[PDB]
Subunit: 353 residues, 4 copies
């Protein structure tokens, strides 16, 4: 692999509804966004079937739950502008239809929720800078104007809240290194300058918070293995060294915190099967990778059910969505094998790939 490579993305974005039912969003062969949901909140439930949003799109869709429980999805239109669609009431399949946020974007949208209940969306703009736009009142269809945060991006952005409520955004730069930028006051439009985390990455960055507040960032490195770095203080500016884990991976990673608070990472492996690694006790070390049967065709997308069971979605070689999950709520639960969520096939609409 080349330093500028971007490992295969996940094929859906997933959210929990207000009642914790999982719902997945992807792009079909018709170039429209479709979605499907659990009818009840557990991994063994029946799914509703695939439902279409009208409209042709040109990125992977991103979904977040509002602070009033309503899901809202963001995507790029054929006009290269940002559009959004929301549930008009929590836990219902009545949606607004696509509504315009304008702008000109050249990445997938990334959506985060501020600690004051307002959604905020990050994109690469037509000028290759990071731009953002936000709700001006929590869980309301009232949005700010677009604003630039500068930079020169070469990945999709990833955003997360710090423990203190400050959004921090990660993206690869023109030097193929991971860079980041942050709110300097919680839920306020007051941002730092860009700083470099000083490793080449060959995937989008993926970020999660540990038990103790600290953000942890995962990405594929120049040698095609998983690497990661974490915050070591109560600040956005002091971080650990980078560490790599042996094992060549061939997609973006997906991280999740398990029921015991330990982190787990899933990624397509060198053999094109799903691989999983977990922290063997508090703060590491990381297990050898374990492999699930079956060749997969995207990165995994990972989610958690209402009972804490982990569930993983992937594109199969039939171009359809498949999933598997933990059979019990336990860090050492056994797993199901791949099951089909049929009715459509999917395409990788990720803008930066």
């Amino acid at each position: 692999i080349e330093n500028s490579a971007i490992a295969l993305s996940g094929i859906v974005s997933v959210a929990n509804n207000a009642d914790n039912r999982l719902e997945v969003f992807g792009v079909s062969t018709d170039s429209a966004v479709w979605h499907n949901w659990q009818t009840a909140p557990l991994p063994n439930s029946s799914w509703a079937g695939w439902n279409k949003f009208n409209g042709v799109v040109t990125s992977k869709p991103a979904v977040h739950r509002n602070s009033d429980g309503r899901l809202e999805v963001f995507v790029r239109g054929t006009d290269n502008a940002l559009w959004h669609n929301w549930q008009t009431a929590a836990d219902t399949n009545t949606w607004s239809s696509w509504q315009p946020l304008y702008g000109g974007i050249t990445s997938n949208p990334e959506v985060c929720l501020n600690s004051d209940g307002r959604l905020e969306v990050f994109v690469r703009g037509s000028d290759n800078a990071l731009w953002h736009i936000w709700q001006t009142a929590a869980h309301t269809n009232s949005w700010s104007n677009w604003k630039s945060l500068g930079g020169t991006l070469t990945s999709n952005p990833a955003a997360h809240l710090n423990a203190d409520g400050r959004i921090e955004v990660f993206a690869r730069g023109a030097d193929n290194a991971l860079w980041h930028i942050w709110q300097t006051a919680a839920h306020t439009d007051q941002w730092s300058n860009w700083q470099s985390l000083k490793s080449v990455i060959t995937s989008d960055p993926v970020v999660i918070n540990n038990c103790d507040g600290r953000l942890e960032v995962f990405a594929r490195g120049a040698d095609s293995t998983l690497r990661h770095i974490s915050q070591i203080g109560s600040d956005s500016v002091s971080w650990s060294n980078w560490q790599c884990l042996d094992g060549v991976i061939t997609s973006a990673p997906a991280a999740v915190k398990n029921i015991s608070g330990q982190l787990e990472v899933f990624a397509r492996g060198a053999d094109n099967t799903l691989w999983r690694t977990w922290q063997t006790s508090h703060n590491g070390p990381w297990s050898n990778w374990s492999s699930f049967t079956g060749i997969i065709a995207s990165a995994p997308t990972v989610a958690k059910n209402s009972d804490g069971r982990i569930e993983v979605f992937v594109l199969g070689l039939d171009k359809a969505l498949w999933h598997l999950w933990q059979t019990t709520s336990s860090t050492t639960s056994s797993w199901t094998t791949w099951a089909l969520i049929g009715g459509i096939t999917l395409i990788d609409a990720s803008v930066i790939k």
Copy 2:
């Protein structure tokens, strides 16, 4: 103190709104519930002023945020029945007015949110058993019939979710010991039998979850000191021994998880000032108690702001509500001194006292 004593309760219940603004609920000298809120989500904000719900009540009110962001308050009426009132839209001061849930209750109400988005309320009934009633659909004013879980209670109940999504309820029994009972399947009406945790307690039990999933229960013991016990596995049935911490306390304790994931407990001390203790690193040991200036007249009620800053409310010797908070988002932040939230005075309407 007598084994059957119940240490002084907190004087308000507090919740975070959908936008994380704090809002407090108590009972005034008119025997009505009044409430007050932060106008913006941080501890230094202006407060709106005290607003009254019409209606005479006969318990401490309990509040929870629905899974659609709307606050809902529960209280006993002059008819000894359960009543409830909700925001008709998240983050707004338009409420339903008191609506009846009937029943006959002889404790404060305790409200929990299931992992499938449905509120559930626990009470001591007229027969001294634990009874419960729940939303039949998440965040909807559709409620079940009353159902008994049996037992013989001598405290108000306290409820919490396990990591796996199963509600577990704690209450003192007729032997003055702490007992507990639990869902055996997440968010389902299928419950265990009552089991004893085998220590006398002289307060309501107070329960919180640690970083790693495990529940931890705090209470005052027979010797008037704080004691605590925790789960040691991935089950509701294996727990640690009880430990006590030196220092005589004179109210219920209030627990909170700080920004670093460590637990902190606040309680009125033997000198009638607010005392605080914290875990000095992961899993303990506990610090010596530190004291804030000022004589207080209730237990503390503890909350967290949108930026993670801890805020503590108490009844003053003027019978009014006072508060103090951390000045920064940091485990070692300095604190403000007691400030008044004036306009009404409050009474302790706790049923079991």
Copy 3:
């Protein structure tokens, strides 16, 4: 129990030889010190049989291994002076016979090894102060003069090294509280003043170091339960609050660090059987007490074999020494049941009892 009570002591002192074989020292009905050893270093080994040191004594004996591997035992004589006896070569049963250190003592002797290889002995003197005397060259029969550290003691002393090499000594004072005093420079005669740790104790204090350097002190409290306190920094002056563990104990406790680094405490319980409690993960919480079959007549004395297996010695109701041990090297190993080390019977010669 009275605040001034001193819970029953262990009936032997035990050391590991240079080759890790266990060797035990106690006082028989003839008022002489006798000893016995494993012939090979594991808990299942044959023992040599009881061997007598000539001479009548008037305290429990204390043993330490020199920095040259030679065991050395300390005891009070009928003259109330301190005497000592050593192996003339490591791992051999040729001893010096009792040799005089003079002084006038009114406690059991406590021996520690400095971080520069010199043994140092602490006692209560005829004036009730703590006194000490030390080797002037490591592992050599060259000793200092006696020196006082003042204080007023009402227990036997217990000493331990800090991580930084500074000896720290713990003893109960005239107020029945635990007090302590420390070297302010490693392995140097430069000491702090006495400070109080501010809890009544009803046993000698027992001290051990945790994995991370920090000392932890155990003792029985005024309510007859086990209590403990630990250092929270890198200093002798900042400590945690005291915590107690439920369960009435009827001897001194004995602490040990297991193979995984977690602490375990053994003590005679309210039913006069041996009880054990362990830390369930890093830094606690503590397990419920588990009980071994059989009524015992002293505190346990705990040791570790060459393979890390824990072994526990106790006085039986036949006045003879019995022991049991872990069958494998594992924190969750099963245990043997009490076996006899016969040939003599023992008496409790502890001075302060």
Copy 4:
């Protein structure tokens, strides 16, 4: 670098005497082993001056303290046989002079102490297998015959005790991977088969035990960065994945456990200065590397003083030994800058280089 490279070794071996004074052993330009020691046990002490052992040698010397406190040094002779020399009494500069152990060896000797007090030496033999030889009685000049453990080695061996008392040996194999082999019963000649840990290494392996018992192995990898792997259970057969840390290193690493129980690693960096990294809390993550001023010409050799202060030795560009150390006993102590231990110059006599 080539996969078969062996990063520059340390230039001395170091031990603590029975009184904890540091003593260093290296090979001078006369091809003899010389040594030097602290006159008193702390990093600021005067050193005695360089003293020669008569005899020409052909490997790096290895030193261990016997279980009776006496230092003993092992080295290869001009006959390619193993020789040894010991202090005739602990803490004295009277030595036996070189005595023969025979054999035919093609690595540096590695010496370990069994949990039953017997030294044991591991070497690569003339046949490229691992061979060993041991004291038959603890701390006695009575040695076994040579015995083979087979294998095909391409590094010097490194040995360490498990928590359970079983010696385990690590060495690079013919595939440039790290392999290992272990006692299956503590301090007994009963060994496992060879197993592979499945990463290429480009240094000797370096092994240390963590607080909680678990061994951790460090080595340079194929990409010239530090990598490490640890045990995850209570067994020699279950280990973590390998992790690498960013930063190109140019010598063997040297690991040490600090006063707080956390690990630290020192290594020459890409700029030829000494680099240090530490675990930022329990179990990681690892800090960025910090650099000390001054170009160095060997790997560091790390030791701990009687007061826990870390001290580091290196070859300077004058071919003499230099050292620096912590000024206080604290994990965050400041450091001295390089000071000379003059009087001889040294050569790298490591056999496998």
